[PDB]
Design a binder for these strands. Sequence first.
DNA 1: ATTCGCAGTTCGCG
DNA 2: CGCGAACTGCGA
Length: 756
Amino acid sequence: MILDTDYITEDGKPVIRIFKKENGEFKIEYDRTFEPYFYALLKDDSAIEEVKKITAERHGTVVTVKRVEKVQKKFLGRPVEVWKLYFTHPQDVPAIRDKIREHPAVIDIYEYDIPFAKRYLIDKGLVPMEGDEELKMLAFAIATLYHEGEEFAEGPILMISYADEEGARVITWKNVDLPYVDVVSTEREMIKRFLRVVKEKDPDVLITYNGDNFDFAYLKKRCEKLGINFALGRDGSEPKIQRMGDRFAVEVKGRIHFDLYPVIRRTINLPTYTLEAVYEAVFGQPKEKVYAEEITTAWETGENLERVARYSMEDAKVTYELGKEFLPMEAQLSRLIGQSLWDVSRSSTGNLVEWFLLRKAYERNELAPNKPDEKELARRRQSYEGGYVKEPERGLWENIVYLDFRSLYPSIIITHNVSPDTLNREGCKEYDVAPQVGHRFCKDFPGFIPSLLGDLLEERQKIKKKMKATIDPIERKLLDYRQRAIKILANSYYGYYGYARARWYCKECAESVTAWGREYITMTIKEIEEKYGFKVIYSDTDGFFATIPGADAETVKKKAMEFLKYINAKLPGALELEYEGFYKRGFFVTKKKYAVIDEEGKITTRGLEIVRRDWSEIAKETQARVLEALLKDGDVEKAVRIVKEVTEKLSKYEVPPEKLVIHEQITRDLKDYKATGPHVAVAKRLAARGVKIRPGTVISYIVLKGSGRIGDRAIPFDEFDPTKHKYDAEYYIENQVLPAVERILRAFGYRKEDLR
DNA sequence: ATTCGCAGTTCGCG
DNA sequence: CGCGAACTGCGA
Ligand SMILES: [Mg+2]
C-alpha cells in the first residue's frame, strides 16, 4: 500500500517518490514524467502568445512556461474554457503565478497552490493506506533534565524509551537496576543506541506524544550540541521540521511520524490532555505522573532512579497502546480523503473536506474555485441564523421519549439538492425553495456536493450491513472504521458551507440548510402536540423530548410509535424521524442543560457543570450525586443532605486538593487578551518564568485562601503545597458547589442558605 | 483555522 | 452598588 509521496530534484527536474509497503517490504517507486501546472482564464485566446513569453526568476535560474493547451472544464456547473499552463519544476509555479495573474488579459488563475506531491496523488488516482497491509509501529519518548531559568534543551536528555509488540525498554547513561533498562556510557551513546534500534526494527510508523513540538526539537538541538547525524529516515535523512501556523510538525522520510497529541485533541473531549489523563480515560487504568523536579532531583542525587526509569518506560508503553487504538481510525480517514496519514492526522475539518472535494473535482473535470483573498475574506464575515432551540418547561418529568432526525442537515442537502452550482440556476423545470431565506435550488440534476454526500451516506449503509455478516474480525474492524470516517466527513459538509476560507463556501447554502431544519423540527413539534396531544418539554435543532404527563409508560411509547408512522409518511426525500430512546425521568434546567435516565438506570447529562472542565471536580461530583438522587431515587431531601455534607467537609478542609482543580484553555497569545481572568493571570505568571504558553494550553489552577481578586489567589495546581498554601474553602462553597447545585434545587424551593 | 445558539463567571466601569 | 463586556465551553 501507499504510505506517502514527495519529490526530489535531479538535474533540475522533479522526480516523484512513491513510498510503499507491499508484502511486508518497503519500496520506493520513481516517476519522472509528471508535469506541474495551473489554469488561466483569458478574455481573448490571442493573448496566449503573450502569456507564453512571461518569465520569472527563482534563485538566478530563469523561470519559463514549458507548454500550454486549451481545455474545457466545468465551473460550478457552467462550461468553461481555460488554458492549462505546464512548467518544468513545481517551484516555478510560486515564482511566476503572480506575474501571470497581474497580466491584463488574464481574468483569473486557478489551482496554483496545490503541492506537487498531493497533485500527483489526485491526478494519478492514487489512494494512500489502501488494503490490509500491516504496518510495523514503534513508539518512543524522552526524559530530560529541567532547570527553571534555562534555554530550550540546555539540559541533556536523561533517558530515551521505546515500545512495540515486544514490550518497552529504556536507554539511559546511569546505572538503573531494572530488567528493561539498557545502560550506556553517555548521552551521545544513548542517542546513537536509539538510532540503531530504529534502524534494526525498521518501523513504518514512529509514534510520539507531542513529538511535533517537543521530542524531535529536543533531539535536534542535542544532536547539534553533541555532533550526531540524527538519521531516522529510511533514506538516511534527518527529521524534517515544518511550520504549521503558530506550531510545528515533523516528518521522518520513508516512515510515518504519528503524533498522538493533535489526533486525540480532536477525537475526544477531556479536561486536560496530559499523557496520564488521556491514557486513564481511554483504557480506564491509572498512570502515575513523575514531575520534572522529581526527575532532576533523582538524577542529581542519584537516588530514586528506578521510579524515573519506570515512568519513562510507561510513557513509551502507553504511547504505543494509544497509537494502536487511534491509528487505524485515522488510517481509514486518510484512505477516505485520499491523502497521507501524516497530513490527515494533523488536519482539521476544513482541510479534510477540501482535499476530498479537490480529488472529486478532478475526477469530474470540475475546475476548483480559489481560496478567498483578504478582500473577499472580509466580505464573508456576514453571519446567519442557526438551529431552533425551544425554551424548556423546566423541572422533573416522567416517562419521556426522545425523537430526532436521522442526519438532519445531510438529509436536507440531499433531498433539496442544496449546492452552489444549483443555487438560483435559471432554465430548470423544477426547483425547491428554502423557507424564510427564499433561495431556490435546481432539482434537474444532482449538484456536485449533494451527489458526493449521497454516495457517502449510501456507501456507509452498505458498510454497516456488510459488517453484521463479516465473520473475519479484522475486516469487520476495518469496515467499522471506514463507516465511522464517512460519518465524520458527511457531517462536515454543512459547516464547510459557512466556512469563510472554504473554496466552495456558500452562505446561501448554509443558511438554507438551517432554515429548512428550523422548519422541519418546528413542524414536527406542533404536529405531535396538535394531533397526538403530547407535551413537548424541550427541543434543540434536530430533536425533541416529549411526554404525556398523565399517561402510562407503555401508553407514551405506543403513541410515540404511532406518531412516527404518521409524520414519516409526510416527510419528503431522505428525511426521517426516529425513536432515539425512552427515559424513565428527566430534569430540564435551562436551554442546553438537562439530564435524563433510562430504564437501566444510566444517567446521561448535557451542558451541566458535570460536563464542563472549567468547574472543579468537587462541584461536578456533588451535582452528579444530587442529580442521581433526584433521577434514580426521587429523593429530594437526600440531595439536600449531600450538599450539606460536602459544604461541611470543605469548611473543615477534609477535601483533597486534587478535586479542587479548575481547567481552562488559553485561546490566544497572552498579549492579545483584553480582560485578565484567573487562568490568564496564572498563565502570565508562568510565561514570566520559563514555561511558554500556546493557544490550546490548558491551565490547571487552584484558588487559595488570601486577599485580592480570584486571579490574585490562583496558582497552578502543580505548585500547590499544604505547608505553604491553603485552598479557599469559602470560594469552593460559594462560587463552585452551591451555584452548581442551587440552580437545580431552586425548582424545589431551596435557597443557598438551605444548604450549609 | 467546520457552523450558530446559549448559560454562566470574573472583572472593571459609572 | 448595578450592569455589561470579555471570555469559555458547551449542544446540536
Ligand atoms: Mg442566543
